[PDB]
Amino acid sequence: LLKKEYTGITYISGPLLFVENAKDLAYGAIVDIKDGTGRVRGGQVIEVSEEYAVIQVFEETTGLDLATTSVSLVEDVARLGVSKEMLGRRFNGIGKPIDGLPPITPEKRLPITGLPLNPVARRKPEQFIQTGISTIDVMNTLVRGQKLPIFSGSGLPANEIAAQIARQATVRPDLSGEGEKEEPFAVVFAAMGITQRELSYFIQEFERTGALSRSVLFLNKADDPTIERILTPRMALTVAEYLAFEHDYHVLVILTDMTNYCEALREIGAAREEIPGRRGYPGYMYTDLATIYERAGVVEGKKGSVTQIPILSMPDDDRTHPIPDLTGYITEGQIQLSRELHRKGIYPPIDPLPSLSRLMNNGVGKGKTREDHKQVSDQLYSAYANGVDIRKLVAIIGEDALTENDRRYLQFADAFERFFINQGQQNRSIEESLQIAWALLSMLPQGELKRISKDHIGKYYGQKLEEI
Amino acid sequence: DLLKKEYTGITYISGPLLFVENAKDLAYGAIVDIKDGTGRVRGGQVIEVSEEYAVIQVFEETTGLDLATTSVSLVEDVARLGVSKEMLGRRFNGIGKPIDGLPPITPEKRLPITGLPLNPVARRKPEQFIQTGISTIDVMNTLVRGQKLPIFSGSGLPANEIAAQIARQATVRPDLSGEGEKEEPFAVVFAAMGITQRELSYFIQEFERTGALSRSVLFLNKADDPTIERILTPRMALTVAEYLAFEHDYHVLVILTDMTNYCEALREIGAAREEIPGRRGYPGYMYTDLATIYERAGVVEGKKGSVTQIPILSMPDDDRTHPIPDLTGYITEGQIQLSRELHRKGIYPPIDPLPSLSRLMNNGVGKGKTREDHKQVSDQLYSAYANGVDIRKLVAIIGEDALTENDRRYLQFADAFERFFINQGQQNRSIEESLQIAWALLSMLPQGELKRISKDHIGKYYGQKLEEIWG
Amino acid sequence: ESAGELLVATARTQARGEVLEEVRRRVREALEALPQKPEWPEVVRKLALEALEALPGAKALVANPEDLPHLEALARERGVELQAEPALRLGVRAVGAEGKTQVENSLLARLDRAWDALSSKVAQALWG
Amino acid sequence: MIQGVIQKIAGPAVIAKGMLGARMYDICKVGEEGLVGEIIRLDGDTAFVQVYEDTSGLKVGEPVVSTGLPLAVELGPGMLNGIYDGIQRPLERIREKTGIYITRGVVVHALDREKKWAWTPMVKPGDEVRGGMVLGTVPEFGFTHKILVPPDVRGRVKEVKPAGEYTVEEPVVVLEDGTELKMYHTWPVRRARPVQRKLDPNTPFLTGMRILDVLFPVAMGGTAAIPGPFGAGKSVTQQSLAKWSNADVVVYVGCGERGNEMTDVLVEFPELTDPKTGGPLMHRTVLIANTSNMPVAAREASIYVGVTIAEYFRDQGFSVALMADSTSRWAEALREISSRLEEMPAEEGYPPYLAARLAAFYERAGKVITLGGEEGAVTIVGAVSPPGGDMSEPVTQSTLRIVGAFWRLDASLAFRRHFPAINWNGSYSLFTSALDPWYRENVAEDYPELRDAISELLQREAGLQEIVQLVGPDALQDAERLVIEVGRIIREDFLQQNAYHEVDAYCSMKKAYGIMKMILAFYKEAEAAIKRGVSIDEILQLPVLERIGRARYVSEEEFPAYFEEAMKEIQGAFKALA
Amino acid sequence: TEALLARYRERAEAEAKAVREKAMARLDEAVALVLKEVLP
């Protein structure tokens, strides 16, 4: 290669830049802009015509001028140098290492935008990931190859739940009947719009319990150039795809706040004078979010997998805001955090009534988990459902108008919220989550358990909550 | 004259427009013929002409055109239509060409489809009362001959059945006004704009049942026909109607089957040109545009014919403040508004009388006409029904047991009103039956509460029971 | 009921259509044989003349080679060039100065332009 | 063959230069790769091309070639049991060639040119053929695919191939004009295939779900819309409609949706059995898959391709069902392209001609008399995705002016796991009165009155639920108590349906009729008993309610006996109660 | 019931013939007039 420059700059305003003839710039290429002092910026060709090429500058245009600036190519598509020894490292949002250690040596360079998977080349997700959180493992199982967001709020603790899931998740293969403990996870952790306090929190969280050895961190502060937000998930997912479909890894990707991603996207889009959308969000936010979420799954004839857990804060706890709404049409369920459970002091304040996992029926049951998993989950949901509405009616009419079983159901609802949901910081395996669930069911008489089949309704019904 | 001039030099085609240069010899508003490299000819109309070029709105779709081979030739300087009495059994498409397989008509005249405004001095006051057989219209929102009366419908509500029932049952009642005894039937001009196949089959089977096809003209623009043609359908239908009425003394009834599709076409052709918009992108001249259609109705002094309009339009989200119903209400004389809540209770026809209105109602009721107690019965009904509805709103807060006795009487009146006076379901009620039912319903209230009716009308109509009219 | 009336009226309408179509075909065949008549040259000259009078500033004239010699003696007077063509028949077509404007004065063209205007006359004169 | 060069690239839109002589809505090959585009605006010497691929990496000055033809599909034997992308390319061939990703620019034929079909003729030399007649037949998975004359061809047969085995591009019938007719032909996807006559629908389109088949029926050639906010299980309902319908052929158009749904179909359907014939379910299904992260400008192409294939199979005499998986995605593609054109938009950024495209697409449905003289039909069930669950947006309000049925999904029902989560208070249907003559001869003599009684029961209970909202179920008499309990019984034993049960997934009309009759009979006996002095407690504690609860988990062949016994028990539970 | 249809079929055919003959009367003048007018 050899450096070829362009000095025909004819117009600079805001974030754009009009380079004259430069007809060898491909549409969508990455360029770099050096000026009279030497400081090199970066840019992307968003439109090329016969007269001029239009360039978007990643940073701000302070210092540029029309006499001394030059533009040279970098490559025709953005790429990233990946390698298996990225595990345990830490990067900044466009891959430069910020842990202090030296840069990596790349064995491939993959385009970061990726390609769509052929629908005939996929296969249905089938196995489950044990997160150690009972209200997810039992009632909203996460299946290997899924996209399961978490709907958080303003001051609800989503950072901690992310970190806890990250350091507790395991694949748990001995349940399957194979005993093939021969492949562990990798955890690619992408963080966007983050502050210094949260950054320190995450660093020491991962360093504390040795979870860094199997993680790759992409951390992006709230004071970095905006273009580096809209690239962090793409580099995270490129690393994940490489690992999963070239080295048979099971990868779990955690994108920590898509609410910041969407604001960066809106700000970049409004600089190209496009037609606005519902609240100022660009008219194509659905396609842009789709190109990120649809990169997870499992492929036929290969052993890897990519599981995604987006995390986002519904603004004003509004479920109809464009961010959570558009994320809802793409993913395969949702986990919702509740504010009242937070006030009560519960943790993690997961609300099991508005949550769901569509792919749950494939990943649980015989040969994958214990046999009773599905019916136990259903009966647990139904029993918690009517306890809540009993509490709603007693709230307005007197608790004098009561029956013998409504006492059972209020007691069940309380012991549920206090023992099943409120697990603190401990890490529960699936067996003991199921045991706690059976204990909580056993304080309702039979005939109230009209949802579970009759054989394990005797096999597991004995033990009561006395064990704590 | 008779020689033909072709303009090559097309310079632009996008959407529904087509710019052609060096065409100063076209008049503003002319009709042209666009012929492509295949020999297929489609139409258009000039909407802006200057010394450099002229702008054309194509009627058909623009698939297949190219800038090298297509040509543009003039047809006429003003868009005209060939009318005749012999088009009283025919069907034409949305631009006036036959679609029943018979040869075209031989025009007696050719009239400009844009029409001319009627002289306010030449007009006449509409007074003849029309009996539709529907009580909520006849008693409370009387329709007169020569009136504009739209139907504000919704998406799933049966406005088409109401229109067809009106067309089947409408008649003048000359024995009540003592004048004339001809009762010559109505001729029906039916213009459909963007209609679906289901509703078209409905209307056709209806007119075929009634035998009303032998005196009806049909202009059909289905939903798979081009969109920009809908600009011409209502103008052609009303040209034919005004011809029939004010030349051969017919009594015409015009039915325009959806003005919402007309406004959609208008907004499309107005956004292609970047007009200053109105409220939701509808062009700023939509008021004038609709007024040039609705105001082609009425009765002319010194002539026997008449023209009556029944536009039908669907308020988009049942929204009375949307631009289309808003402007149409600002033009026409009153409206007949349908109710979704009444439709959900199984009531047909679901006409709620409170947001309806007929402005010309007072011209054609009273002594020397229907009956002397018509007006007072009507507004007494309005008052009592309004009271019933407000008492419903109160029950929704303080429960039914807390009510008084007269409040329960008003509640019962509202209920029986909705279930016996509104809900008639395809039967044809003369005006006397309607007033009889109205008095039977009024007799539920104490005689001292009918404060809008005089003492003598009370004395000689109060006290009928509903069980007597029917059990 | 009215179904029989519709039947008889349809019959009448389509009969009138048949006869009018026949008259039109009759005149279409009467026209298409004129270049054998002795009035041919003078009518072609006046046709070309009104065509040229409609394009102030034509640059050429397209016609039929078979009647080309009928058309030489009147274009030289104004300088408008000539050109022959087999497809153009029973008339002449000019060409405007830019190449992007034409005027044709064929016979069948005038027939199709005037037939609708004269249909009322044919009806009123062939029935009453 | 018009050819120019690229002049300006911006997103999926490319302006070509030197294209004087290119026609509107023709197909072009952009670039040296040969990407496929369509001309949508001509200007001076240029042409505006929308590209159905990714325009990344393109360069100014590359070739552009116009082919002179609009977008077309190949219609013929070999489409069933396949999966296609937005412009009819077989995805299995793409996988055999270029691996597990979808790279741009691959070229494959739509119909396999190497297969052998057992041709059986039906015409003789000297015979007259016109558009739409039948030349011969070919077996395909147990159907009888019959070869049609292309809709605009006339002539007299000159020779015929004599009953052998051939490929699709083997000319089988040659006319006296010299024209050759093969086993396939092409058709422009934006022109509706003509028919002889449109008929009125008189026969129900059975979906298998009780609430839709009973309360809001749709007729055979009708159109329906099912708009639902996220999390309301729209995907399960669409799959169920694809799985149990009584159509002969199902065309599923996945216009901008998840890819795991296409994978679910591809994996499960070869196992399930067709109810009508013995074959696998996949043998009657055609998929068009254009997922959410595939090129945007191809979503509309996929819609048109799907409806043209459905029209073809209708022309063959079958009755087709077309499921357009989402039309809001098509609307968004329209909006994006119009944004690249610098057009002025309508209300919510959409182009001002969206309603026209929607209406022209929905107007391709209906029962017809084909050109060959036989009878077929096409039923369209389009999905919408309003943004805030907001039914006042442009797409929903434009769809509700042409559909005949409206099936409104609701999120409140789905947040308590009530499925299929259809709101019976906001939905409606316009085919229900024209279908009663069929219901009376094919279900029961008094089915309509059963349905009406159920509906008015539901209306009353939902009405008085507002009163009980404030003053508790303690404050109203036994009649209203019984009405609320019967409402609960209805909407937990009749309206609900588990889609993953091996029995409750599909439900016939006889079964729904039986359950309705059971419930109404119980209601009448209870009303009598109450007004002769019994209380709600003993009414609720009866065991026959358990019999009615388990009624929907009973197989179809053993339902008649269950029904008779349950009627006997309903009688005895109150006869013995004096 | 059908006598009306029979009477009307007769009336239709009769009037069709009447119109055709009344036309063939003066068609020869109609065509000459049109040819007169179309000509320049």
Side-chain angles (χ1 to χ4, degrees), chain C residues 60-113:
Chain C
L61 269 178
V62 196
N64 202 348
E66 54 98 19
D67 82 322
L68 177 57
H70 315 169
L71 270 294
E72 286 197 345
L74 74 165
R76 300 303 98 195
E77 285 63 19
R78 40 185 59 195
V80 193
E81 191 194 315
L82 260 65
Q83 154 64 11
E85 218 287 332
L88 162 57
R89 277 183 32 99
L90 314 98
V92 57
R93 172 180 65 240
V95 171
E98 325 84 349
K100 300 180 307 178
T101 287
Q102 305 183 326
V103 165
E104 177 144 333
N105 204 0
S106 158
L107 278 179
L108 273 76
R110 310 171 57 105
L111 191 91
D112 301 8
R113 299 266 308 197

Side-chain angles (χ1 to χ4, degrees), chain B residues 323-382:
Chain B
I324 305 165
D326 180 80
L327 300 181
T328 300
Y330 269 125
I331 306 174
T332 47
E333 284 109 5
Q335 69 274 356
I336 297 312
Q337 178 159 322
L338 304 202
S339 188
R340 196 177 285 281
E341 309 82 347
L342 287 179
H343 176 58
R344 262 159 187 155
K345 303 179 183 172
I347 294 180
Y348 175 95
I351 296 186
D352 47 348
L354 287 155
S356 298
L357 174 72
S358 167
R359 297 187 190 276
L360 296 177
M361 171 184 175
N362 303 320
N363 291 352
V365 300
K367 203 180 199 60
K369 290 127 171 176
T370 59
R371 220 160 77 178
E372 69 261 346
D373 63 315
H374 192 159
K375 181 78 181 181
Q376 315 191 358
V377 163
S378 156
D379 47 13
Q380 187 54 54
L381 280 169
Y382 269 111

Side-chain angles (χ1 to χ4, degrees), chain D residues 344-506:
Chain D
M344 178 159 296
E347 309 184 18
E348 194 164 329
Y350 291 114
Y353 49 79
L354 170 83
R357 312 281 185 106
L358 281 181
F361 156 73
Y362 276 104
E363 202 54 34
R364 286 173 185 259
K367 195 152 87 177
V368 302
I369 280 294
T370 61
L371 299 177
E374 50 264 3
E375 178 179 0
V378 160
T379 318
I380 290 182
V381 180
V384 193
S385 297
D390 183 17
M391 301 295 167
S392 62
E393 66 146 350
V395 192
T396 311
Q397 289 306 317
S398 311
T399 314
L400 289 196
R401 306 215 287 259
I402 40 176
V403 301
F406 178 47
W407 299 333
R408 167 178 193 150
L409 290 164
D410 185 9
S412 309
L413 296 166
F415 283 166
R416 74 195 76 259
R417 275 104 151 112
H418 181 281
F419 295 119
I422 273 171
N423 176 16
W424 56 85
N425 283 319
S427 304
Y428 62 78
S429 156
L430 305 189
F431 305 107
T432 188
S433 64
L435 279 166
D436 288 349
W438 189 94
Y439 285 152
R440 287 186 194 282
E441 330 297 323
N442 279 272
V443 172
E445 176 66 29
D446 66 311
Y447 171 90
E449 290 87 31
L450 261 285
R451 182 197 60 216
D452 293 334
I454 286 291
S455 312
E456 62 92 15
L457 259 185
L458 271 170
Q459 173 202 330
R460 276 170 55 197
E461 76 94 20
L464 67 94
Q465 220 292 321
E466 313 286 350
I467 294 315
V468 82
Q469 172 98 348
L470 297 84
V471 308
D474 48 0
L476 48 82
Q477 296 79 355
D478 276 331
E480 285 71 2
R481 290 281 306 285
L482 179 70
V483 165
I484 281 177
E485 292 315 316
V486 154
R488 193 259 306 159
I489 285 281
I490 289 166
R491 69 181 173 74
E492 298 183 352
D493 290 25
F494 180 76
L495 288 186
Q496 275 196 359
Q497 191 147 2
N498 197 326
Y500 304 111
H501 205 282
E502 65 280 341
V503 188
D504 202 15
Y506 155 76

Side-chain angles (χ1 to χ4, degrees), chain A residues 23 26-27 47-50 115-119 122 124 278 286 294 319 325 329-332 353 355 381, chain D residues 7-9 11 55 57-58 60 91 100-102 230 258-260 263 268 292-293 348 386-387 415 417:
Chain A
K23 285 161 49 56
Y27 166 80
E47 155 179 348
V48 57
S49 69
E50 219 177 346
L115 296 171
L117 272 161
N118 202 333
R122 298 202 180 205
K124 305 184 68 190
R278 179 52 63 97
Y286 172 90
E294 289 279 83
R319 188 153 162 142
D325 181 75
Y329 283 114
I330 317 182
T331 63
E332 279 113 12
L353 289 183
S355 318
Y381 183 90
Chain D
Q7 164 187 346
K8 175 157 144 43
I9 316 177
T55 52
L58 276 173
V60 178
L91 284 186
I100 64 172
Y101 296 100
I102 301 193
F230 92 91
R258 307 180 186 89
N260 291 85
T263 302
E268 302 166 13
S292 53
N293 57 344
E348 194 164 329
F415 283 166
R417 275 104 151 112

Side-chain angles (χ1 to χ4, degrees), chain B residues 142-170:
Chain B
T142 303
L143 171 64
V144 301
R145 190 155 69 176
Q147 190 180 343
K148 301 180 284 290
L149 195 53
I151 293 185
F152 286 7
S153 160
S155 90
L157 318 177
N160 294 325
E161 313 201 6
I162 299 181
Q165 177 170 7
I166 287 181
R168 176 178 75 240
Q169 300 176 173

